[PDB]
Amino acid sequence: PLMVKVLDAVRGSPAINVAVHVFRKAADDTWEPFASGKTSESGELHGLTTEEEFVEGIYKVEIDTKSYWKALGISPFHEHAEVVFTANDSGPRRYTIAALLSPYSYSTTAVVTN
Amino acid sequence: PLMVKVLDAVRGSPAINVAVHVFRKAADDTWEPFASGKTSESGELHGLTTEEEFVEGIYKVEIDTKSYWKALGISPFHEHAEVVFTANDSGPRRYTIAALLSPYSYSTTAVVTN
Amino acid sequence: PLMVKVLDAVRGSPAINVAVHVFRKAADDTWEPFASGKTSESGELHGLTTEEEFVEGIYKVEIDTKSYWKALGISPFHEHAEVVFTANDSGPRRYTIAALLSPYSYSTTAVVTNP
Amino acid sequence: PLMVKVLDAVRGSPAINVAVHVFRKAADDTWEPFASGKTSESGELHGLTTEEEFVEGIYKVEIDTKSYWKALGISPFHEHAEVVFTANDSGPRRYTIAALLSPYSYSTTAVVTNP
Ligand SMILES: Cc1cc(C(=O)Nc2cc(Br)c(O)c(Br)c2)cc(C)c1O
Ligand SMILES: Cc1cc(C(=O)Nc2cc(Br)c(O)c(Br)c2)cc(C)c1O
Secondary structure: OEEEEEEEOOOOEEOOOOEEEEEEEOOOOOEEEEEEEEOOOOOEEOOOOOOOOOOOEEEEEEEOHHHHHHHOOOOOOEEEEEEEEEEOOOOOOEEEEEEEEEOOEEEEEEEEEO | OEEEEEEEOOOOEEOOOOEEEEEEEOOOOOEEEEEEEEOOOOOEEOOOOOOOOOOOEEEEEEEOHHHHHHHOOOOOOEEEEEEEEEEOOOOOOEEEEEEEEEOOEEEEEEEEEO | OEEEEEEEOOOOEEOOOOEEEEEEEOOOOOEEEEEEEEOOOOOEEOOOOOOOOOOOEEEEEEEOHHHHHHHOOOOOOEEEEEEEEEEOEOEOOEEEEEEEEEOOEEEEEEEEEOO | OEEEEEEEOOOOEEOOOOEEEEEEEOOOOOEEEEEEEEOOOOOEEOOOOOOOOOOOEEEEEEEOHHHHHHHOOOOOOEEEEEEEEEEOEOEOOEEEEEEEEEOOEEEEEEEEEOO
């Protein structure tokens, strides 16, 4: 039910081998590790979770943009990019978190479908 | 070699049934019709052209954003969204033109791969 | 009543010396030259037109992004970024057309205010 | 040395009365409250800090986008937009953090200048 896709606005390419960490907000308001991985050659990260595990709640997707840029020899502004949202069972069932990266900027959108 | 993908930033969805026209710049600097279609349920428009037909040159992709917004009952700013670029055989072979739409704004990127 | 602002997403800076050409659709459906200029050190382009001259119509703001990037020695994707909109059709408004540029991407937004 | 500007991509207007909370990472690795405020009628938030107080560090600018959209009666996707960056590590700079908001999307950029 959750996919992350990352694109590079400088090279016009997927953002490959980018580390992505997902956290779930705990009762005590701390961020608990939930899922992680690295984007593929297509810039996508599949298989993070299952429907059974992905219950309603607040999640944070942290994209390691700083390492990505440094590995390309580029000095970036941000420490990481964070996307924080609530999963809601009354809306559609599949979430795509998409990010478009530049050294000093990023854009993100949600594509939520059934 | 050419795919167009359109997303909706208001609803968090693909932008479905959006008209897209592609033009090729002619010798006399006019825009000649090249390919067209409507985005699918996934927001994508496949099959516009073939490798044989898609020669180097300047192309314009015009996305009919005004009709899209009006069909959803929303008053938009732009007449359309235009993406104008040169196809170059020395770069990678497949072009994805991606657009992310809002009533008063849009973002576009190119994903160019082999 | 028309201002253009351009930022650079690679540099984290205003986009300086960006050429901008504005056209207005004529009665015969062609794009007539309306005004032009370049962004300043702040990334802003002021003084394009006047409230008398900026009548109702369909306008095209062409931001010369390729020329900008090439002048910086970079080979970008797009030829230009075009922003096409109907203006002043409910009376005079003030328009800011804002753009944010990367070599293979851009975003644009409008800020429309009623004086 | 720190300014936040927020625009609304649905309205084509400044995003007014947007709450913004700034944190700075402490020695113990927690996020310490640093400053806060709200955007004005222009969409800008000035006066958050001073050059004395805005020392080197890792800062988090939290823009309360959900609260903004809910106050407008809209159910948005994100909880907030967070912008996290190292500041002043090569001496004092001026930072503008700019954001452009839609219910299911946002973009952010930085303008960094050397006074
Ligand atoms: C935040 C953002 C994402 C995207 C985006 O990720 N598009 C996109 C989404 C999926 Br799913 C795809 O498979 C592809 Br290809 C592009 C495009 C733009 C112009 C943008 O500003
Ligand atoms: C993240 C973003 C910011 C902006 C933006 O905020 N531009 C801007 C910055 C400052 Br300081 C201004 O005074 C004004 Br007007 C616009 C524009 C776009 C198209 C965009 O994607």
